[PDB]
């Protein structure tokens, strides 16, 4: 076929020409699929072998069924990612190879109950939750420091502030750090079409601060669109589970004390205004370490400042190189 070979040359030429163009936006996957095994790809052999919970970058537009993208790994080339409708179509192909998909069981019962597949056997139903396979996540995952206890107290604030200072100085010219006083745990996507569109409604949500929470969500996306590294300084985060179900998916960096005895001796030497909060502070210390390590992204358990700083720096440096 002369049509497939000619469109192959044009597609390859487009990839070479577009290899030096700015990145437009990014999405996040949640299903295990391969971009090479599919026979509908316009270019064969240049697919992506991605897995569940992977990050892809999109630069230009191809069509309503396919897109051009590249991985976030070091030295990642350009691959093709199926469209959400195409992924929905290929999801239906995964559940059709089975013997049955609707109500009629095939337990040696053939010839009596035909039972044509109703709407319950298609994608029209099962819309109670309808988790989207593709989500419009920010262009990069933000960096957040959490623990070992609640923020706003003396024991906690300098440790992140000094760590922010080291990140700011080492990444001079490529860092943009801002303090978000608004809440970040209420970043929802399937609540309503437009919750509190106007502030003059004088409703429960119109007069509340919820509209401020969602307004800051788009600010992060635009800030992440600048390609510069961003670290959030919010003090409304105490557990990765509160931000786990959000679309931000930040880099959960956990710094922890080696022993509770070490922490309970640091609080004593701080000042009389801090032992009043010792009881509540110790509550967060035990509940945060009870979270499994795999929930967090990178751990900071070193007892020396120099050991942890470059341990975190190399994780951030490799991300900068891999995403370029």
């Amino acid at each position: 076929e002369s049509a497939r070979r000619e469109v192959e040359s044009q597609a390859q030429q487009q990839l070479e020409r577009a290899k030096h163009k700015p990145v437009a936006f990014a999405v996040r996957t949640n299903v295990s699929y391969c971009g090479v095994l599919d026979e509908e790809c316009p270019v064969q052999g240049s697919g992506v072998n991605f897995e569940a919970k992977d990050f892809l970058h999109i630069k230009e537009k191809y069509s309503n069924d396919w897109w051009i993208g590249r991985l976030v790994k070091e030295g990642g080339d350009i691959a093709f990612i199926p469209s959400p409708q195409r992924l929905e179509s290929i999801r239906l192909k995964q559940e059709q190879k089975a013997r049955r998909s609707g109500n009629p069981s095939s337990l040696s019962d053939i010839g009596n109950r035909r039972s044509p597949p109703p709407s319950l056997a298609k994608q029209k139903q099962k819309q109670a939750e309808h988790v989207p396979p593709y989500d419009v996540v920010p262009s990069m995952r933000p960096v957040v420091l959490v623990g070992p206890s609640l923020k706003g107290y003396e024991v906690t604030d300098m440790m992140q502030k000094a760590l922010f200072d080291f990140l700011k100085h080492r990444f001079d010219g490529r860092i943009s750090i801002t303090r978000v006083t608004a809440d970040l745990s209420l970043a929802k996507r399937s609540v309503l079409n437009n919750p509190g569109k106007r502030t003059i409604i004088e409703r429960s949500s119109a007069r509340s601060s919820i509209a401020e929470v969602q307004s800051e969500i788009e600010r992060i996306f635009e800030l992440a669109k600048s390609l510069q590294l961003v670290v959030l300084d919010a003090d409304t985060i105490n557990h990765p589970a509160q931000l786990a179900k959000t679309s931000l998916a930040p880099i959960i960096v956990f710094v922890k004390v080696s022993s509770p005895k070490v922490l309970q001796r640091l609080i004593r030497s701080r000042g009389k205004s801090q032992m009043k909060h010792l009881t509540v502070q110790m509550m967060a210390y035990d509940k945060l370490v009870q979270c499994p390590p795999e929930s967090f992204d990178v751990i900071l358990d070193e007892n020396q400042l120099e050991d942890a700083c470059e341990h975190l720096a190399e994780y951030l440096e490799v991300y900068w190189r891999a995403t370029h």
Partner: peptide, 14 residues
């Protein structure tokens, strides 16, 4: 574990 977590916890602001 205490010496490294005491100077750093105070020198950031003080």
């Amino acid at each position: 574990d205490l010496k490294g977590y005491l100077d750093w916890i105070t020198q950031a602001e003080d």
